Design a protein around this nucleic acid. Structure first.
Ligand SMILES: *O[C@H]1[C@@H](O)[C@H](n2cnc3c(=O)[nH]c(N)nc32)O[C@@H]1COP(=O)(O)OP(=O)(O)OP(=O)(O)O
Ligand SMILES: Nc1ncnc2c1ncn2[C@@H]1O[C@H](COP(=O)(O)OP(=O)(O)O)[C@@H](O)[C@H]1O
Ligand SMILES: [Cl-]
Ligand SMILES: [Mg+2]
Ligand SMILES: [Zn+2]
Length: 670
RNA sequence: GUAGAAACAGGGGCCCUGCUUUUGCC
């Protein structure tokens, strides 16, 4: 049965308009899309049949919505099917579309199907529903599809499906006022060819009875007064930078650092330095290799020190020390050249003091104590509480898991951990969430942004954001995880910037809502004209728009020529010939699974034992075993014409100049 | 293989460009 705000929201789309539905998370936007579907099905003109596609950005959501529509519509005699990457391969997409009244998909499935010629026109659909439609932007699959929709609209020799978009936040982009916010929202509208924005105006009070927007609480807590740990590590980082200058004048390559150790700014300095160092070209190739490798290692070490600093700010000294000791264990197990031995020793020199510092309990993190106090208060007051605790990085989430494991809240509450996809698998993720839902003692969940939206999580009465800031849409989603009766959302930070950030988000949320009500004042003509002008602008922006050797990204040793490379299925870059087999060595893949028609066999590495750089994998494919598949990020390209060296993060530039795989060519190579 | 977001800063005169962090998708 429908609520009145649900009926209200469905009205423009029921009248056949391309509609954008803005309504709060969990308010029942999906139920609204179902009401529109029902109406769609019944009001088809003579001789027409409906074909609905529901698009979802993620597999969990894909699965949830698939089963919603199955349950709602199969009992009414409708055929409801779904395609995701998990079955894309074993089904014909054309056939599924042919046999189905409603099809639910992840959007890339459709993109793949246009690109491979399976589909030619979007006229096969009468209604396209885009869950989380605010993702229609840039090179997102949603926007690839809507670009195709608009290209067809512009060669208007066909009828196009109705568009429906579901979101809880249209966003504001870079808007600083109502006017620029209005521009941003209209842009989104133009990308989706919207004709009406549908919000709750008439039935606001009923909405407010079902939805309870948590009271936020923003707490600024004090940092450590002294951080001896960070003094030490910083000196090591200074030592390491000076050693780096000894090796090669990085002043002639990159700039000198501002020694702002343990900052994002430093993090990005090291990253820029790395790319410059690896693009070093010398006459003497032996020296190029020697220098580049030693700078590779130095920058790697500098990054880990920086990481350890940042970890120590948000967590315990021991968590930061653990991170480094695990790293150095790996150093000791790798090539472990003389330079790596030197660095490990300089560290082990200082390690006794660090172990000492990490054991002092007056050397404890104020911000982490405050976190623990917050949790203790909640579970003391209400032991039924279920908490969702968010933090930015995997390293921080791991640290917080260890904390809450070794120091359980009120000495009984146990944490679960949720990270993205060692990551976690979707089965693992689901396992964790089920425990978090049902368990008596597992009432705390620690998560990265994996938990912001989409995947189904039991409602929480406490949401804690631990130095976890972001944009207005993130804020809106994250609060939607806290809708249990008398829920709180608490932002814990030691940074005024983050407090101001959250102050801005409040402004923008209210700016956004005001911007929408102004747009809703306009008549259809005014709106339609505006959206059209932007589609025309977008269109005019689109109007405007040799042989190389690959070198080990680390030791600069010759790998292969671009002439030896073949592309399989536009994605996978294999290397032909016996010569290349001399250049690498393999180890069994630790996860030897199958995907895209390929079976993973091995990891590939630079054969240079002093390097051992990861180059990719080997696979079984068709009638071929142990095909090497290289990844672009492991290599530096060098032009055979100019001699000059290039870095590339994506194949996209190069692919134009590479031959495609030919099973007949391959067959002759034996 | 590749997409979004956020942070950090090289180019154009507010977009472009990269980078990491993070999540995703095939
Ligand atoms: O360049 C990649 C790519 O060609 C192929 N590949 C690996 N993972 C994926 C994937 O999720 N999706 C697609 N389309 N293609 C993929 O293998 C090449 C090498 O990649 P990696 O070296 O990262 O391979 P793998 O993930 O097995 O290494 P690791 O995860 O064990 O580090
Ligand atoms: N009118 C209704 N009657 C009963 N349950 C409803 C109703 N509207 C929504 N729900 C329930 O609310 C939950 C959230 O709805 P959903 O459409 O997923 O929200 P949204 O897409 O707006 O985030 C679902 O479990 C759904 O069954
Ligand atoms: Cl070698
Ligand atoms: Mg990989
Ligand atoms: Zn190498």
């Amino acid at each position: 049965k429908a609520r009145s705000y649900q009926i209200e929201l469905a009205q423009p789309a029921i009248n056949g308009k391309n509609a954008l539905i803005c309504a709060p998370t969990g308010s029942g936007k999906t139920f609204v899309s179902i009401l529109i579907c029902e109406h769609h099905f019944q009001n088809m003109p003579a001789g027409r049949k409906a074909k609905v596609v529901f698009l979802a950005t993620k597999v969990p959501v894909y699965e949830q919505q698939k089963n919603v529509f199955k349950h709602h519509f199969e009992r009414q005699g409708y055929s409801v099917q779904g395609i995701s990457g998990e079955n894309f391969s074993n089904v014909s997409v054309e056939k599924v579309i042919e046999d189905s009244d409603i099809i639910v998909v992840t959007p890339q499935i459709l993109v793949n199907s246009f690109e491979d010629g399976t589909l030619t026109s979007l006229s096969i659909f009468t209604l396209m529903i885009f869950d989380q439609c605010h993702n229609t932007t840039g090179n997102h699959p949603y926007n690839v599809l809507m670009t195709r929709y608009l290209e067809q609209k512009f060669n208007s020799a066909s009828q196009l499906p109705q568009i429906l978009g579901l979101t809880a936040s249209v966003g504001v982009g870079n808007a600083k006022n109502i006017e620029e916010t209005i521009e941003h929202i209209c842009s989104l509208c133009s990308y989706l060819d919207i004709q009406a924005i549908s919000t709750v105006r008439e039935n606001i009070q009923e909405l407010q009875r079902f939805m309870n927007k948590p009271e936020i609480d923003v707490r600024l807590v004090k940092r450590r007064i002294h951080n001896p740990f960070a003094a030490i590590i910083s000196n090591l980082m200074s030592e390491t930078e000076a050693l780096m200058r000894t090796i090669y004048s990085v002043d002639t390559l990159s700039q000198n650092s501002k020694k702002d150790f343990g900052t994002q700014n430093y993090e990005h300095w090291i990253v820029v330095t790395q790319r410059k160092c690896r693009l070093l070209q010398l006459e003497d190739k032996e020296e190029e290799s020697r220098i580049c490798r030693a700078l590779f290692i130095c920058t790697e070490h500098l990054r880990k020190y920086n990481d350890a600093l940042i970890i120590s700010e948000d967590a315990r000294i021991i968590d930061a020390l653990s991170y480094l000791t695990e790293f150095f264990t790996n150093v000791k197990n790798g090539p472990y050249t003389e330079l790596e031995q030197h660095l490990t020793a300089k560290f082990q020199e200082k390690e006794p003091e660090l172990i000492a510092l990490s054991k002092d309990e007056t050397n404890e993190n104020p911000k982490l104590e405050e976190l623990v106090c917050i949790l203790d208060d909640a579970y003391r007051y209400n032991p039924q509480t279920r908490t969702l605790l968010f933090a930015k990085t995997r390293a921080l989430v791991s640290a917080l898991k260890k904390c809450m494991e070794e120091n359980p809240i009120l000495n009984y509450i146990k944490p679960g951990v949720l990270m993205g996809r060692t990551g976690m698998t979707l089965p693992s993720q689901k396992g964790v969430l089920d425990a978090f839902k049902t368990s008596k003692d597992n009432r705390l969940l620690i998560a990265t942004s994996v938990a912001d939206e989409g995947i189904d999580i039991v409602q929480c009465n406490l949401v804690v954001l631990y130095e976890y800031s972001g944009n207005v849409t993130k804020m809106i989603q994250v609060r939607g995880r806290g809708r249990a009766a008398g829920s709180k959302c608490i932002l814990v930070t030691s940074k005024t910037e983050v407090v101001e950030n959250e102050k801005c988000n409040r402004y923008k949320e209210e700016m956004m809502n005001k911007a929408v009500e102004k747009i809703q004042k306009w008549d259809e003509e005014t709106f339609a004209k505006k959206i059209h002008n932007l589609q025309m602008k977008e269109r005019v922006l689109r109007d405007s728009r040799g042989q190389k050797n690959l070198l080990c990204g680390k030791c600069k040793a010759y790998a292969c020529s671009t002439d030896d490379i073949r592309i399989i299925k536009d994605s996978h870059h294999i290397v032909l010939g016996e010569a290349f087999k001399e250049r690498y060595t393999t180890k069994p893949h630790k996860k030897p699974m199958q995907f895209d028609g390929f079976e993973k066999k091995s990891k590939m590495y630079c054969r240079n034992n002093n390097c051992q750089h990861d180059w990719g994998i080997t696979v079984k494919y068709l009638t071929f075993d142990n095909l090497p598949v290289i990844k672009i990020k492991s290599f530096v390209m060098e032009s055979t014409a100019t001699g000059t060296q290039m870095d590339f993060q994506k194949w996209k530039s190069i692919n134009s100049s590479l031959k495609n795989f030919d099973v007949e060519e391959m067959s002759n190579l034996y």
